[PDB]
Ligand binder design. Structure first.
Ligand SMILES: CC(C)=CCC/C(C)=C/CSP(=O)(O)OP(=O)(O)O
Ligand SMILES: CC(C)=CCC/C(C)=C/CSP(=O)(O)OP(=O)(O)O
Ligand SMILES: C=C(C)CCOP(=O)(O)OP(=O)(O)O
Ligand SMILES: C=C(C)CCOP(=O)(O)OP(=O)(O)O
Ligand SMILES: [Ca+2]
Ligand SMILES: [Ca+2]
Ligand SMILES: [Ca+2]
Ligand SMILES: [Ca+2]
Ligand SMILES: [Ca+2]
Ligand SMILES: [Ca+2]
Lengths: 300, 290
């Protein structure tokens, strides 16, 4: 029981999030069906099953906002979910965060072994780029090439991998970071893929990305604050991964620096910032407004 | 002489391109590890890109993006292959491996970011004025590199290590096709793809070249000198691997590699003498000491 009903999320948001999760899973199923039945591929399927699909949902809903067909947008939605999944397979490794459970199930290296986890994460990164450049993703090659270039910049040693590297350099020193420092780290480690996801609908429509980029800056920070709160107050049965971890690793997080009350308040302010950033879209962006409430109020 | 000069110049060009691109990233250990992992090498795959581009009258200043891309992808694959959980190698290209010099996390992440960089490099607008070309280069790269291509090969290779019986010739050949054939095939087809030209002849060339290359790599593991090859030798027997030498013997493996030179060369007939550097590359892949 995730306690979702108790939160009274808007009907359209709930229906659309449920449909997006089923659509992403169906697309992974179809794409992976073409691959050989070997442990690495089974591990790819394991690692991509489940999840909230926030990032894939952002792609689908920003595409909807820009009148892009769902049948095209699914490619980019699945792509970002593949990229995200790869990052978690590697993060969970013994040499990194060393976690035994993810999404309520054993992690890849636990169910198989470390080599299988390394390779499944490697192939999932590759699959993200296959999915965004597949001709089904857009009738425009310029759009596909730009989606892939942007994804590489979000994902690599200026984006997500940079954030990871900085995080590890902190874990190892058990170092005390300022609020600015953990914010710069967050921007790479988690902000970059959420930014790519929210900008995707505009990129697919060859439209201005500025409003969705601003939206995503707020949303991503709210999301990370919420994640840091769940580590402190959350229930491992609901969250599907171990909690209480950050303290033991000597991690400065938004909660360790600000305290819970002020972290919650900051996340609440960021809902407003995120919603304000959508003003130019008017009512058509209402699902994306409710997404900002979800990212803070979710139990998992 | 002209072949050797072209190869030397290509190696310098690829190193210069890595030096430019990587200097734009922050000066952190992960980026230092990316530079470490991409330095050196024969640059066979990059050279294939540059020379098949030349063949198809593509500008060298465009082709360098794809040449550096395939070298980044290849470099990533070696950083992960060398890991303790994989082949557990302490030396590569005469230098410590990334996990030895740094640590396993840094190796995992550097390899990750090098894969990502490969896709950044092919999709950068410099790679081609045609977005159709860039999207095609990226899509084909992903299909060559992932779990239908290079990673498939790696998965098959690891499964072989605890197979009940040694692999047959057909089985190690299918393994080779994924593990080393795929990236070599991408590299050779790159010039045709850059020109939106027919890839069939270069795909055939590369099927032969890649198999000859692996047979040669298997021969070097058996007869080669670690000081010359830059990595440990005798590894295959230690792991109990079926290889082309274990299945054929050295004499017959050498003769097969020579037969595949002829096949590679015949594949280029439609190009005439404009393809001579590619013919010399096939002879190189079998002659080479490292
Ligand atoms: C493996 C690479 C390059 C980057 C990892 C990016 C990433 C999303 C890290 C996880 S943030 P973290 O707070 O550690 O996430 P949970 O395990 O708590 O779900
Ligand atoms: C890490 C992944 C997915 C693939 C590795 C692909 C690759 C080129 C492996 C090396 S084949 P191998 O004969 O083992 O190469 P050497 O170490 O002998 O140079
Ligand atoms: C970036 C972070 C904090 C990793 C977990 O992300 P999610 O909380 O979105 O995980 P899933 O829904 O994909 O399981
Ligand atoms: C695919 C294999 C057999 C890995 C080594 O390839 P190379 O022998 O081309 O290595 P470098 O020149 O890049 O060092
Ligand atoms: Ca973690
Ligand atoms: Ca961590
Ligand atoms: Ca966390
Ligand atoms: Ca090896
Ligand atoms: Ca091996
Ligand atoms: Ca070898």
């Amino acid at each position: 029981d995730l306690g979702t009903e108790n939160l009274y999320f808007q009907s359209m948001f709930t229906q659309r999030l449920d449909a997006a999760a089923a659509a992403v899973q169906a697309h992974f199923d179809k794409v992976l069906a073409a691959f050989e039945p070997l442990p690495i591929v089974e591990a790819m399927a394991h690692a991509t099953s489940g999840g909230k699909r926030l990032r894939g949902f952002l792609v689908l809903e920003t595409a909807r906002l820009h009148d892009i067909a769902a049948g095209e947008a699914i490619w980019s939605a699945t792509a970002i979910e593949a990229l995200h999944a790869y990052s978690l397979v590697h993060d969970d490794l013994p040499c990194m965060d060393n976690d035994d459970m993810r999404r309520g199930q054993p992690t890849v290296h636990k169910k198989w072994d470390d080599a299988t986890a390394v390779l499944a994460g490697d192939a999932l990164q590759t699959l993200a780029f296959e999915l965004v450049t597949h001709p089904g993703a857009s009738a425009s090659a310029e759009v596909r090439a730009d989606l892939a270039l942007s994804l590489a910049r979000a994902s690599g040693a200026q984006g997500m991998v940079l954030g990871q590297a900085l995080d590890i350099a902190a874990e190892t020193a058990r170092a005390p970071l300022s609020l600015d420092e953990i914010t710069r780290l967050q921007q790479g480690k988690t902000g970059a893929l959420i930014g790519w996801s929210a900008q995707a609908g505009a990129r697919l429509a060859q439209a201005d990305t500025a409003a969705l980029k601003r939206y995503a800056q707020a949303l991503g920070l709210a999301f990370q604050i919420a994640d840091d709160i769940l580590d402190v107050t959350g229930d491992s049965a609901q969250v599907g991964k171990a909690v209480g971890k950050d303290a033991s690793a000597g991690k400065a997080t938004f909660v360790s620096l600000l305290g819970l009350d002020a972290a919650r308040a900051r996340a609440m302010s960021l809902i407003d910032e995120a919603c304000d950033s959508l003003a130019t879209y008017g009512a058509k962006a209402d699902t994306l407004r409710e997404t900002a409430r979800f990212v803070v109020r979710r139990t998992h």
